[PDB]
Amino acid sequence: STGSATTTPIDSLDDAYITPVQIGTPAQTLNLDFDTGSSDLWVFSSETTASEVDGQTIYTPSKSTTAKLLSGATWSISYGDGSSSSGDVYTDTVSVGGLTVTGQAVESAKKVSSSFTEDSTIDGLLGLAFSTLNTVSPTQQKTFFDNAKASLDSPVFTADLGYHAPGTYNFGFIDTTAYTGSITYTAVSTKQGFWEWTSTGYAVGSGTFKSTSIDGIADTGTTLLYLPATVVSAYWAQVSGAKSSSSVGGYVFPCSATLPSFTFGVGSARIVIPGDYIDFGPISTGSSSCFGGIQSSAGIGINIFGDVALKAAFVVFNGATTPTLGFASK
């Protein structure tokens, strides 16, 4: 089997991407944030504290004839941005782009943190990291990909995120028309539960490539590109007037600037992030100070190849017995 679904930016800055997901019988369609940096499929629901729901579409298990309470199971998760959610668990039928899993753990939120409430466009998350990170207790549950894998034509999914435009998540096949040149594959460590890999280096604008190993995660659920302070300083040094602002919480730059590109290495291959992908706009409405899309990972404890990086590539998440990641230009 295969599936294919369009993923759409939630706003004009590509802060995140939503993909429609069919849950239950009859289908209830919710728009979920596909997140290769976590492993829980959770949704706003009829069980969510009413004051914490503000415009989201909810899953109502009582209206699904295939929903079953997973007795005794609870979940609770926190993300890198300090947001969180928790609740109980149903199993139900879940379909993405024509690909159906029966008995998928659908984690129903009883509580969500303010950032989720305040974002009307995201109805929940669909985790695509390794199932070892799944938070369901006392019986850990499998991700949608993990459940689908054996049925897929090939045990892979691909992320093709757009810049200020829709893109595609495919399951079970590689669309050879969706990228240019070749896909370069690189090793993955699953030791921390993430799609963790090692970039071979970077360049800033038209500058020379620096060969250096950069361990990080391919994370569709993180907006920006978070790299070591040395790398980030080298990037922003090429932008006149750019500075790290403690008050804003990162590098900012004059909105009048033309940003240089940023290249990262995948083996001997190179992925180029155009300068425009690194502009996240005014820090506040009407400001001429703009927020940068490349930020320091110092104090995160890990480097994160988030959407800024991934949207410059066609990315293969290869879930073979020994997982690997593939990157192609597009």
PDB file of all heavy atoms in Angstrom, residues 5-11 14-20 31-34 121-122 160-162 164-169:
ATOM      1  N   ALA A   5      -0.457  12.649   0.902  1.00  0.00           N
ATOM      2  CA  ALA A   5      -1.268  13.748   1.403  1.00  0.00           C
ATOM      3  C   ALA A   5      -0.537  15.071   1.251  1.00  0.00           C
ATOM      4  O   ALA A   5       0.690  15.162   1.403  1.00  0.00           O
ATOM      5  CB  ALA A   5      -1.641  13.524   2.861  1.00  0.00           C
ATOM      6  N   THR A   6      -1.301  16.107   0.947  1.00  0.00           N
ATOM      7  CA  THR A   6      -0.752  17.445   0.836  1.00  0.00           C
ATOM      8  C   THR A   6      -0.617  18.061   2.204  1.00  0.00           C
ATOM      9  O   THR A   6      -1.504  17.900   3.052  1.00  0.00           O
ATOM     10  CB  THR A   6      -1.670  18.332  -0.033  1.00  0.00           C
ATOM     11  OG1 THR A   6      -1.699  17.786  -1.352  1.00  0.00           O
ATOM     12  CG2 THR A   6      -1.195  19.802  -0.077  1.00  0.00           C
ATOM     13  N   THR A   7       0.511  18.739   2.425  1.00  0.00           N
ATOM     14  CA  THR A   7       0.749  19.435   3.672  1.00  0.00           C
ATOM     15  C   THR A   7       0.846  20.925   3.371  1.00  0.00           C
ATOM     16  O   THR A   7       1.429  21.320   2.362  1.00  0.00           O
ATOM     17  CB  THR A   7       2.015  18.881   4.385  1.00  0.00           C
ATOM     18  OG1 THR A   7       2.103  19.405   5.716  1.00  0.00           O
ATOM     19  CG2 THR A   7       3.313  19.197   3.649  1.00  0.00           C
ATOM     20  N   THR A   8       0.241  21.743   4.229  1.00  0.00           N
ATOM     21  CA  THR A   8       0.008  23.151   3.918  1.00  0.00           C
ATOM     22  C   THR A   8       0.527  24.030   5.057  1.00  0.00           C
ATOM     23  O   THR A   8       0.238  23.770   6.224  1.00  0.00           O
ATOM     24  CB  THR A   8      -1.509  23.405   3.738  1.00  0.00           C
ATOM     25  OG1 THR A   8      -2.019  22.567   2.693  1.00  0.00           O
ATOM     26  CG2 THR A   8      -1.805  24.862   3.382  1.00  0.00           C
ATOM     27  N   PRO A   9       1.290  25.083   4.733  1.00  0.00           N
ATOM     28  CA  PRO A   9       1.708  25.980   5.817  1.00  0.00           C
ATOM     29  C   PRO A   9       0.533  26.627   6.553  1.00  0.00           C
ATOM     30  O   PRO A   9      -0.462  26.988   5.933  1.00  0.00           O
ATOM     31  CB  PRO A   9       2.571  27.034   5.103  1.00  0.00           C
ATOM     32  CG  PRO A   9       2.363  26.856   3.677  1.00  0.00           C
ATOM     33  CD  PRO A   9       1.794  25.508   3.414  1.00  0.00           C
ATOM     34  N   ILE A  10       0.650  26.767   7.873  1.00  0.00           N
ATOM     35  CA  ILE A  10      -0.436  27.323   8.671  1.00  0.00           C
ATOM     36  C   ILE A  10      -0.542  28.833   8.580  1.00  0.00           C
ATOM     37  O   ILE A  10      -1.573  29.402   8.934  1.00  0.00           O
ATOM     38  CB  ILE A  10      -0.325  26.909  10.153  1.00  0.00           C
ATOM     39  CG1 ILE A  10       0.953  27.460  10.806  1.00  0.00           C
ATOM     40  CG2 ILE A  10      -0.383  25.387  10.278  1.00  0.00           C
ATOM     41  CD1 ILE A  10       0.918  27.446  12.323  1.00  0.00           C
ATOM     42  N   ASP A  11       0.520  29.477   8.107  1.00  0.00           N
ATOM     43  CA  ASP A  11       0.565  30.925   8.042  1.00  0.00           C
ATOM     44  C   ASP A  11       1.586  31.369   7.013  1.00  0.00           C
ATOM     45  O   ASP A  11       2.246  30.535   6.378  1.00  0.00           O
ATOM     46  CB  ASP A  11       0.811  31.551   9.431  1.00  0.00           C
ATOM     47  CG  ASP A  11       2.162  31.193  10.044  1.00  0.00           C
ATOM     48  OD1 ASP A  11       3.118  30.863   9.310  1.00  0.00           O
ATOM     49  OD2 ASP A  11       2.273  31.283  11.297  1.00  0.00           O
ATOM     50  N   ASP A  14       5.361  30.079   7.232  1.00  0.00           N
ATOM     51  CA  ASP A  14       5.636  28.637   7.293  1.00  0.00           C
ATOM     52  C   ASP A  14       6.021  28.235   8.723  1.00  0.00           C
ATOM     53  O   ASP A  14       6.959  27.469   8.927  1.00  0.00           O
ATOM     54  CB  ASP A  14       6.783  28.202   6.350  1.00  0.00           C
ATOM     55  CG  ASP A  14       6.507  28.449   4.878  1.00  0.00           C
ATOM     56  OD1 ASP A  14       5.357  28.718   4.501  1.00  0.00           O
ATOM     57  OD2 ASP A  14       7.473  28.355   4.086  1.00  0.00           O
ATOM     58  N   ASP A  15       5.306  28.738   9.718  1.00  0.00           N
ATOM     59  CA  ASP A  15       5.625  28.415  11.103  1.00  0.00           C
ATOM     60  C   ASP A  15       5.454  26.928  11.403  1.00  0.00           C
ATOM     61  O   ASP A  15       6.133  26.376  12.269  1.00  0.00           O
ATOM     62  CB  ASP A  15       4.781  29.264  12.051  1.00  0.00           C
ATOM     63  CG  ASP A  15       5.343  30.668  12.235  1.00  0.00           C
ATOM     64  OD1 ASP A  15       6.577  30.802  12.363  1.00  0.00           O
ATOM     65  OD2 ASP A  15       4.557  31.642  12.242  1.00  0.00           O
ATOM     66  N   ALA A  16       4.541  26.298  10.680  1.00  0.00           N
ATOM     67  CA  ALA A  16       4.301  24.869  10.779  1.00  0.00           C
ATOM     68  C   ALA A  16       3.459  24.475   9.580  1.00  0.00           C
ATOM     69  O   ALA A  16       3.005  25.335   8.819  1.00  0.00           O
ATOM     70  CB  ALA A  16       3.586  24.506  12.083  1.00  0.00           C
ATOM     71  N   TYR A  17       3.267  23.172   9.419  1.00  0.00           N
ATOM     72  CA  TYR A  17       2.513  22.622   8.307  1.00  0.00           C
ATOM     73  C   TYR A  17       1.442  21.675   8.832  1.00  0.00           C
ATOM     74  O   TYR A  17       1.696  20.912   9.772  1.00  0.00           O
ATOM     75  CB  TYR A  17       3.452  21.868   7.362  1.00  0.00           C
ATOM     76  CG  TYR A  17       4.530  22.732   6.735  1.00  0.00           C
ATOM     77  CD1 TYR A  17       5.660  23.106   7.444  1.00  0.00           C
ATOM     78  CD2 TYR A  17       4.417  23.164   5.434  1.00  0.00           C
ATOM     79  CE1 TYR A  17       6.638  23.895   6.870  1.00  0.00           C
ATOM     80  CE2 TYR A  17       5.396  23.951   4.851  1.00  0.00           C
ATOM     81  CZ  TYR A  17       6.496  24.306   5.578  1.00  0.00           C
ATOM     82  OH  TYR A  17       7.475  25.082   5.008  1.00  0.00           O
ATOM     83  N   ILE A  18       0.259  21.724   8.225  1.00  0.00           N
ATOM     84  CA  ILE A  18      -0.831  20.840   8.607  1.00  0.00           C
ATOM     85  C   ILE A  18      -1.209  19.939   7.449  1.00  0.00           C
ATOM     86  O   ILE A  18      -1.225  20.351   6.283  1.00  0.00           O
ATOM     87  CB  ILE A  18      -2.074  21.596   9.139  1.00  0.00           C
ATOM     88  CG1 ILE A  18      -2.474  22.745   8.206  1.00  0.00           C
ATOM     89  CG2 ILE A  18      -1.825  22.058  10.547  1.00  0.00           C
ATOM     90  CD1 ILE A  18      -3.798  23.408   8.600  1.00  0.00           C
ATOM     91  N   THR A  19      -1.556  18.712   7.810  1.00  0.00           N
ATOM     92  CA  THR A  19      -1.905  17.666   6.874  1.00  0.00           C
ATOM     93  C   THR A  19      -3.218  17.048   7.328  1.00  0.00           C
ATOM     94  O   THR A  19      -3.357  16.691   8.489  1.00  0.00           O
ATOM     95  CB  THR A  19      -0.800  16.592   6.875  1.00  0.00           C
ATOM     96  OG1 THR A  19       0.472  17.228   6.720  1.00  0.00           O
ATOM     97  CG2 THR A  19      -1.002  15.584   5.753  1.00  0.00           C
ATOM     98  N   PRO A  20      -4.183  16.896   6.415  1.00  0.00           N
ATOM     99  CA  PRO A  20      -5.461  16.339   6.848  1.00  0.00           C
ATOM    100  C   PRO A  20      -5.351  14.837   7.124  1.00  0.00           C
ATOM    101  O   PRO A  20      -4.684  14.112   6.369  1.00  0.00           O
ATOM    102  CB  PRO A  20      -6.388  16.630   5.658  1.00  0.00           C
ATOM    103  CG  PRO A  20      -5.477  16.622   4.479  1.00  0.00           C
ATOM    104  CD  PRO A  20      -4.199  17.266   4.990  1.00  0.00           C
ATOM    105  N   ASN A  31      -6.758  18.371  11.064  1.00  0.00           N
ATOM    106  CA  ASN A  31      -5.531  18.838  10.446  1.00  0.00           C
ATOM    107  C   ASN A  31      -4.398  18.755  11.457  1.00  0.00           C
ATOM    108  O   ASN A  31      -4.358  19.521  12.428  1.00  0.00           O
ATOM    109  CB  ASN A  31      -5.722  20.264   9.945  1.00  0.00           C
ATOM    110  CG  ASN A  31      -6.739  20.335   8.847  1.00  0.00           C
ATOM    111  OD1 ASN A  31      -6.886  19.392   8.067  1.00  0.00           O
ATOM    112  ND2 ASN A  31      -7.473  21.428   8.793  1.00  0.00           N
ATOM    113  N   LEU A  32      -3.482  17.821  11.217  1.00  0.00           N
ATOM    114  CA  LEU A  32      -2.435  17.500  12.182  1.00  0.00           C
ATOM    115  C   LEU A  32      -1.056  17.977  11.722  1.00  0.00           C
ATOM    116  O   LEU A  32      -0.757  18.074  10.532  1.00  0.00           O
ATOM    117  CB  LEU A  32      -2.399  15.991  12.466  1.00  0.00           C
ATOM    118  CG  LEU A  32      -3.713  15.354  12.908  1.00  0.00           C
ATOM    119  CD1 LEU A  32      -3.503  13.903  13.321  1.00  0.00           C
ATOM    120  CD2 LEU A  32      -4.371  16.133  14.036  1.00  0.00           C
ATOM    121  N   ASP A  33      -0.223  18.276  12.704  1.00  0.00           N
ATOM    122  CA  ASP A  33       1.160  18.673  12.481  1.00  0.00           C
ATOM    123  C   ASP A  33       2.007  17.401  12.486  1.00  0.00           C
ATOM    124  O   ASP A  33       2.204  16.786  13.538  1.00  0.00           O
ATOM    125  CB  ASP A  33       1.538  19.615  13.620  1.00  0.00           C
ATOM    126  CG  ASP A  33       2.914  20.212  13.498  1.00  0.00           C
ATOM    127  OD1 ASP A  33       3.685  19.806  12.611  1.00  0.00           O
ATOM    128  OD2 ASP A  33       3.217  21.098  14.345  1.00  0.00           O
ATOM    129  N   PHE A  34       2.451  16.976  11.305  1.00  0.00           N
ATOM    130  CA  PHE A  34       3.284  15.795  11.177  1.00  0.00           C
ATOM    131  C   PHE A  34       4.672  16.128  11.704  1.00  0.00           C
ATOM    132  O   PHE A  34       5.353  17.027  11.204  1.00  0.00           O
ATOM    133  CB  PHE A  34       3.371  15.345   9.715  1.00  0.00           C
ATOM    134  CG  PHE A  34       2.166  14.592   9.213  1.00  0.00           C
ATOM    135  CD1 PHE A  34       0.907  14.741   9.782  1.00  0.00           C
ATOM    136  CD2 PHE A  34       2.312  13.725   8.153  1.00  0.00           C
ATOM    137  CE1 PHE A  34      -0.182  14.026   9.290  1.00  0.00           C
ATOM    138  CE2 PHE A  34       1.244  13.008   7.661  1.00  0.00           C
ATOM    139  CZ  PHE A  34      -0.002  13.153   8.220  1.00  0.00           C
ATOM    140  N   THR A 121      -5.197  26.642  14.057  1.00  0.00           N
ATOM    141  CA  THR A 121      -5.010  25.890  12.814  1.00  0.00           C
ATOM    142  C   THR A 121      -4.512  24.462  12.999  1.00  0.00           C
ATOM    143  O   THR A 121      -4.557  23.679  12.061  1.00  0.00           O
ATOM    144  CB  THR A 121      -4.006  26.585  11.853  1.00  0.00           C
ATOM    145  OG1 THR A 121      -2.673  26.475  12.371  1.00  0.00           O
ATOM    146  CG2 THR A 121      -4.371  28.049  11.647  1.00  0.00           C
ATOM    147  N   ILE A 122      -4.014  24.133  14.188  1.00  0.00           N
ATOM    148  CA  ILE A 122      -3.457  22.814  14.453  1.00  0.00           C
ATOM    149  C   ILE A 122      -4.365  22.040  15.400  1.00  0.00           C
ATOM    150  O   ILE A 122      -4.575  22.454  16.544  1.00  0.00           O
ATOM    151  CB  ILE A 122      -2.007  22.927  14.978  1.00  0.00           C
ATOM    152  CG1 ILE A 122      -1.097  23.428  13.850  1.00  0.00           C
ATOM    153  CG2 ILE A 122      -1.536  21.590  15.534  1.00  0.00           C
ATOM    154  CD1 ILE A 122       0.324  23.671  14.250  1.00  0.00           C
ATOM    155  N   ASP A 160       8.253  16.523   1.730  1.00  0.00           N
ATOM    156  CA  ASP A 160       8.541  17.487   0.669  1.00  0.00           C
ATOM    157  C   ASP A 160       7.805  18.774   1.035  1.00  0.00           C
ATOM    158  O   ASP A 160       6.713  19.057   0.545  1.00  0.00           O
ATOM    159  CB  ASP A 160       8.066  16.900  -0.668  1.00  0.00           C
ATOM    160  CG  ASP A 160       8.288  17.810  -1.845  1.00  0.00           C
ATOM    161  OD1 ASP A 160       8.978  18.850  -1.721  1.00  0.00           O
ATOM    162  OD2 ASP A 160       7.768  17.458  -2.927  1.00  0.00           O
ATOM    163  N   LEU A 161       8.407  19.545   1.931  1.00  0.00           N
ATOM    164  CA  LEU A 161       7.771  20.737   2.460  1.00  0.00           C
ATOM    165  C   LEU A 161       7.993  21.904   1.523  1.00  0.00           C
ATOM    166  O   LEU A 161       9.082  22.067   0.979  1.00  0.00           O
ATOM    167  CB  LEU A 161       8.338  21.083   3.826  1.00  0.00           C
ATOM    168  CG  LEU A 161       8.210  20.004   4.893  1.00  0.00           C
ATOM    169  CD1 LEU A 161       8.843  20.479   6.196  1.00  0.00           C
ATOM    170  CD2 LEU A 161       6.765  19.594   5.111  1.00  0.00           C
ATOM    171  N   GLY A 162       6.959  22.727   1.345  1.00  0.00           N
ATOM    172  CA  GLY A 162       7.046  23.876   0.469  1.00  0.00           C
ATOM    173  C   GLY A 162       7.490  25.146   1.162  1.00  0.00           C
ATOM    174  O   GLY A 162       7.324  25.318   2.351  1.00  0.00           O
ATOM    175  N   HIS A 164       6.506  28.764   1.452  1.00  0.00           N
ATOM    176  CA  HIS A 164       5.336  29.606   1.221  1.00  0.00           C
ATOM    177  C   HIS A 164       4.380  28.928   0.246  1.00  0.00           C
ATOM    178  O   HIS A 164       3.748  29.592  -0.574  1.00  0.00           O
ATOM    179  CB  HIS A 164       5.737  30.981   0.679  1.00  0.00           C
ATOM    180  CG  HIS A 164       6.485  31.821   1.664  1.00  0.00           C
ATOM    181  ND1 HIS A 164       7.027  33.048   1.340  1.00  0.00           N
ATOM    182  CD2 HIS A 164       6.768  31.616   2.972  1.00  0.00           C
ATOM    183  CE1 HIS A 164       7.620  33.557   2.407  1.00  0.00           C
ATOM    184  NE2 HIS A 164       7.489  32.704   3.405  1.00  0.00           N
ATOM    185  N   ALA A 165       4.253  27.608   0.351  1.00  0.00           N
ATOM    186  CA  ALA A 165       3.439  26.842  -0.593  1.00  0.00           C
ATOM    187  C   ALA A 165       3.177  25.459  -0.044  1.00  0.00           C
ATOM    188  O   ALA A 165       3.924  24.986   0.801  1.00  0.00           O
ATOM    189  CB  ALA A 165       4.168  26.715  -1.901  1.00  0.00           C
ATOM    190  N   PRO A 166       2.125  24.800  -0.535  1.00  0.00           N
ATOM    191  CA  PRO A 166       1.898  23.421  -0.117  1.00  0.00           C
ATOM    192  C   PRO A 166       2.996  22.484  -0.581  1.00  0.00           C
ATOM    193  O   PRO A 166       3.749  22.785  -1.507  1.00  0.00           O
ATOM    194  CB  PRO A 166       0.562  23.068  -0.780  1.00  0.00           C
ATOM    195  CG  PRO A 166      -0.114  24.393  -1.019  1.00  0.00           C
ATOM    196  CD  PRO A 166       1.010  25.322  -1.338  1.00  0.00           C
ATOM    197  N   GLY A 167       3.058  21.342   0.091  1.00  0.00           N
ATOM    198  CA  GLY A 167       3.967  20.259  -0.233  1.00  0.00           C
ATOM    199  C   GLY A 167       3.277  18.936   0.011  1.00  0.00           C
ATOM    200  O   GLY A 167       2.052  18.859   0.021  1.00  0.00           O
ATOM    201  N   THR A 168       4.074  17.893   0.210  1.00  0.00           N
ATOM    202  CA  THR A 168       3.570  16.539   0.223  1.00  0.00           C
ATOM    203  C   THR A 168       4.294  15.648   1.223  1.00  0.00           C
ATOM    204  O   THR A 168       5.512  15.681   1.333  1.00  0.00           O
ATOM    205  CB  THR A 168       3.753  15.900  -1.168  1.00  0.00           C
ATOM    206  OG1 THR A 168       3.154  16.737  -2.162  1.00  0.00           O
ATOM    207  CG2 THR A 168       3.102  14.534  -1.231  1.00  0.00           C
ATOM    208  N   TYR A 169       3.509  14.841   1.934  1.00  0.00           N
ATOM    209  CA  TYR A 169       4.010  13.663   2.647  1.00  0.00           C
ATOM    210  C   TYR A 169       3.551  12.425   1.902  1.00  0.00           C
ATOM    211  O   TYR A 169       2.347  12.231   1.708  1.00  0.00           O
ATOM    212  CB  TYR A 169       3.480  13.597   4.080  1.00  0.00           C
ATOM    213  CG  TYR A 169       4.182  14.518   5.043  1.00  0.00           C
ATOM    214  CD1 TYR A 169       3.616  15.727   5.430  1.00  0.00           C
ATOM    215  CD2 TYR A 169       5.405  14.174   5.583  1.00  0.00           C
ATOM    216  CE1 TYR A 169       4.283  16.582   6.309  1.00  0.00           C
ATOM    217  CE2 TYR A 169       6.067  15.003   6.473  1.00  0.00           C
ATOM    218  CZ  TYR A 169       5.501  16.200   6.830  1.00  0.00           C
ATOM    219  OH  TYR A 169       6.174  17.011   7.708  1.00  0.00           O
TER     220      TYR A 169
END
